[PDB]
Amino acid sequence: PFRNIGIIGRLGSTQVLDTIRRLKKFLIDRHLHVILEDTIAEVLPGKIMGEICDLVVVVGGDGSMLGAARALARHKVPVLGINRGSLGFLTDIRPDELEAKVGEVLDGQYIVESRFLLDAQVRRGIDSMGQGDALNDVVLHPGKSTRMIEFELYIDGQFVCSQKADGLIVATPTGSTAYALSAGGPIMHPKLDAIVIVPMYPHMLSSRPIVVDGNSELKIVVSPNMQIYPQVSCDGQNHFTCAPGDTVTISKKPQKLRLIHPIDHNYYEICRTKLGWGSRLGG
Template sequence: MDQFRNIGIIGRLGSSRVLDTIRRLKRFLLERHLHVILEDSIAEMLPGHGMQTCTRKLMGEICDLVIVVGGDGSLLGAARAMARHGTPVLGINRGSLGFLTDIRPDELEARVSEVLEGRYLMESRFLLEAEVRRGMESIGQSDALNDVVLHPGKSMRMLEFELYIDGHFVCSQKADGLIVATPTGSTAYSLSAGGPIMHPKLDAIVIVPMYPHTLSSRPIVVDGNSELKVVVSPELQIYPQISCDGQNHFTCAPGDTLSIRKKAQKLQLIHPVEHNYYEICRTKLGWGSRLGVQE
């Protein structure tokens, strides 16, 4: 009995290459007599498709597998929606980097066939949940697969805040902002701000100050079950922004508290059987290749 019968397709909008790949994927899945469900926003770009459509929110409830055609940004958005249902996600890369969407369009049929036949690697990736509170009131909340970022928005002013980990005061800090990243997000914004690369299997969170006022401020790696609290200085003259995966944004005020913790539900991310994390890093980050030495 096939493990994946109801297969959802999510695609990045505004790209003819993505639409071409989705048409090819749809045709391939229908030839295998599978039930294909298109996300409603991408379905509008495919007139006459004849497929069932649904919202992204509903897709996690009715699909056995969701295939994302696009870049890592597309997969981040899908991940936040699918994690709550435990629906596995597979990425076909139509973006640039492709740390998460690791199937090339030219190998679509071969790799998707392997997955449908049960030959794949499944990884659990944890997400973060962030909430901003103003006194007793919740001002905003969102999830992030990559990172939660406190930043000044359009202002050029430096931020000032206090950091607490598991209720313990760590430090007060002046900086351009703060990045709190998962291992998945350690190769994204966190990396460009000087954070470490963390293997996806690590149960850890990295806290990276952005251009801190004090040169001794360095990234801190803490246990993945840590509860973080960032208190925005009441004396601050601007209203900072919180961004989750660079996609969901909300504004906080001086004196607000940002709480960050691991989300209970995890993303189930599918890779081809030959997936190699270090090869991905070597290719995407331009690391040196072998010297030709025989092993």
Template sequence: MEQFKHVGVIGRLGSAEVVETLKRLKKFLLSEGVHVILDKPLADVLPGHGLQVCSHNMMGEVCDLVVVIGGDGSMLAAARALARYRVPVLGINRGRLGFLTDIHPDEIEQRVGEVLAGKYIMESRFLLQAVVKRQGQPIGQSDALNDVVLHPGKVARMIEFEVYIEGQFVYSQRADGLIISTPTGSTGYSLSGGGPIMHPKLDAIVVVPMFPHTLTSRPLVVDGNTEIKIAISGHNTTYPQVICDGQVHIPASPSDTITVAKKPQRLKLIHPLNHNYYEVCRRKLGWGNRLGEG
């Protein structure tokens, strides 16, 4: 197990609960003799902290572990920034669902203490790379831990596009858009669009049409090493957007292409020893308990 002596902390801004949790985490980490490093935006809301401050990129280079205080959105942003550095990431939930940030704030001393003692589960999650090209030249790109979505933007109008997998034509489509999701993202937007839940250990990608103009179009699960290309029809009057993790927006135009493939670097995600994926699904998605349980 890795030893964590230099711990970075990233948090969601604009939340008094995050600041409260940050103070508690800081106090505990310092009591354990850990060198604590704050993300600069987070440091600005904690005057007089007396800690080292650095950017996301520098944090990836100097930290053994990064703790994210917030919700899944905070973890998604951290994953895109830190995956390239292969630094492990641990989440303390101050959001709503908390599929990725699974330590409760009241359990900081116990659960973070276990992680520092080498008692944890390490998962490897892959990200997607999306590249938007115009006349063969890249005009925008981003990574995504959850999903890459072709979306009509502010206009409620269908998009015409073609889908190619590993260079082979799959179908042409008229739909509100398309969701390309990792297993991590399969419990998010993809699920809302009718996609399957995929266990995080699966090496697979799901392609989910959004309100397709056909009764026979269904989600398609492909190998995780597959390259997917979307060709936006030149006949479109809509100028759609490519959205990564619901956070990064890349404007696209008719005749543009979007290429989506697995990113070489993976996210190292840490869970406490009591982590149970199916229990998380039961709790977050409202699945039924065992018969006889309240």
């Protein structure tokens, strides 16, 4: 199917668009059809992408891949990441090895890694008040208020606890290395069928992250005794205002993201270089 190739970038970088110019010329010389993102095309003179491309190449950091994954996941189109120079959890191809790597994938040497996303649904009673997907995390937080908020947590209909905190981070394995990690959560291997729940700046010192089955359904009830309207954020990009008493329901989407890596992809190598963990011992 690899004939219609889409390219997405994050603007504002010399080095990005240089990688872009190198990629276009490499695929054109392979007699492939190349479709630029409407916004990236305005930076080099010369949402619907998943529907027409058989493969989408994302140039940028893990953040660029994040924005593109929700759109590409629902369209069942494979996604390949090129980083800005160092490995990212979602972007494995270095810019200077672009021709080797990308040509390797187009020729048929690549590994496929499903990643699951979350569905966030805000409700007032049974009325939907907003729905968003998230590859990394669904985050409940106070928005513009500088006060702590209050909420209850249910998992598969069972009451877990109430708490006072800034909010809550609910993360996939992909998101376990992003906000959740900074907030004290564990790393979860990308193949783990699990969801982590990480309290944000909790009042209660014995608050601790919980890891639950990936097929679990989460329900957050915003406290009806609050005076402020908190916010729910998906991948830090799609936002919804919640009223006191609203519910936020979170579970795993059926359609997972088809993420492509070169055959030499190594998840732990990525952890070592990004997080600085020790390499093999010497003498």
